[PDB]
């Protein structure tokens, strides 16, 4: 298990434009195209992202390319985020993956919104952080996924992903 395998489990892989859990146009492995209601706008984003005129469909290789970019960006971003660096630097590799997962899903802003939980994490108060994380729109809207991430934070193991 690693960040890629983990996110691949959580986001799936779709080669044609689809709508994510929030109703937003997305493609590949959870690559958000735009929050716009416009399919045309989403297709324009796609083309720009890939570098060609696609008509809403990409190859797997293409999908993995955006995915690789997205995970890298996720990491790079956290590493230069003040609200997040310290807590992330404080974590072990497993829990770091969980943190990266949440940023990929919701963005730095969204993740920094979890101030209290982050703090318990920084304190290494595992169960407390776990409880706190669950008190969120995030957990209510994506409970299965949220529960998986929370277990990782709690335990520092990949068990929750262990057979997905
Ligand atoms: Cl992009
Ligand atoms: Cl879910
Ligand atoms: K998805």
């Amino acid at each position: 298990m690693n960040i890629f395998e983990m996110l691949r489990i959580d986001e799936g892989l779709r080669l044609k434009i689809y709508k994510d859990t929030e109703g937003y146009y997305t493609i590949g492995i959870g690559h958000l195209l735009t929050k716009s209601p416009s399919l045309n706008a989403a297709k324009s984003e796609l083309d720009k992202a890939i570098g060609r005129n696609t008509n809403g469909v990409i190859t797997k290789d293409e999908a993995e390319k955006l995915f690789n970019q997205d995970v890298d960006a996720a990491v790079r971003g956290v590493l230069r985020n003040a609200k997040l660096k310290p807590m992330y630097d404080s974590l072990d590799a497993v829990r770091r993956a969980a943190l990266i997962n949440m940023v990929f899903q919701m963005g730095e802003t969204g993740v920094a919104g979890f101030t209290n939980s982050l703090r318990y994490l920084q304190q290494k108060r595992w169960d407390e952080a776990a409880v706190n994380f669950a008190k969120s729109r995030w957990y209510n809207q994506t409970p299965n996924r949220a529960k998986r991430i929370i277990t990782v934070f709690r335990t520092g193991t990949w068990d929750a992903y262990k057979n997905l």
Side-chain angles (χ1 to χ4, degrees):
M1 189 51 52
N2 57 56
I3 188 57
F4 292 86
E5 296 176 358
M6 184 195 209
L7 276 161
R8 173 64 183 75
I9 285 164
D10 287 330
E11 302 287 355
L13 167 74
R14 278 159 275 180
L15 303 186
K16 136 107 267 219
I17 292 182
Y18 68 88
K19 274 156 189 209
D20 65 14
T21 65
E22 299 290 334
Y24 302 129
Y25 292 119
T26 307
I27 195 139
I29 306 161
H31 180 82
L32 174 63
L33 292 165
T34 182
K35 295 187 209 157
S36 157
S38 171
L39 178 56
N40 281 108
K43 245 111 114 252
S44 153
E45 292 293 334
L46 177 62
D47 293 342
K48 160 171 72 82
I50 302 298
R52 65 184 177 79
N53 202 340
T54 70
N55 225 39
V57 181
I58 65 179
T59 75
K60 179 163 191 253
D61 266 10
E62 282 168 345
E64 286 171 348
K65 183 171 177 92
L66 298 178
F67 183 42
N68 222 106
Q69 286 167 174
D70 290 350
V71 170
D72 193 39
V75 177
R76 284 167 62 84
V78 162
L79 283 180
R80 56 166 124 80
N81 182 301
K83 269 2 137 203
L84 312 170
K85 188 169 173 43
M87 165 281 315
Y88 189 73
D89 285 339
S90 82
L91 295 175
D92 57 278
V94 185
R95 299 189 171 83
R96 282 162 173 174
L99 195 274
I100 299 296
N101 191 308
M102 287 191 75
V103 168
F104 185 97
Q105 181 190 4
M106 76 182 62
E108 307 194 340
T109 313
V111 180
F114 284 84
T115 307
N116 302 152
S117 319
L118 293 182
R119 172 196 10 277
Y120 285 127
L121 285 188
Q122 209 162 349
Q123 245 134 57
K124 304 196 175 312
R125 298 166 65 199
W126 324 116
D127 289 17
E128 292 164 281
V131 169
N132 189 274
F133 269 115
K135 300 163 187 203
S136 58
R137 177 176 191 280
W138 171 62
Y139 171 90
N140 282 278
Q141 305 303 310
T142 47
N144 288 353
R145 184 183 183 155
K147 299 190 171 127
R148 274 193 300 283
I149 288 291
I150 286 174
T151 73
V152 169
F153 279 134
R154 198 163 41 98
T155 69
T157 82
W158 293 112
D159 304 352
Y161 301 65
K162 289 153 23 164
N163 295 325
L164 318 202

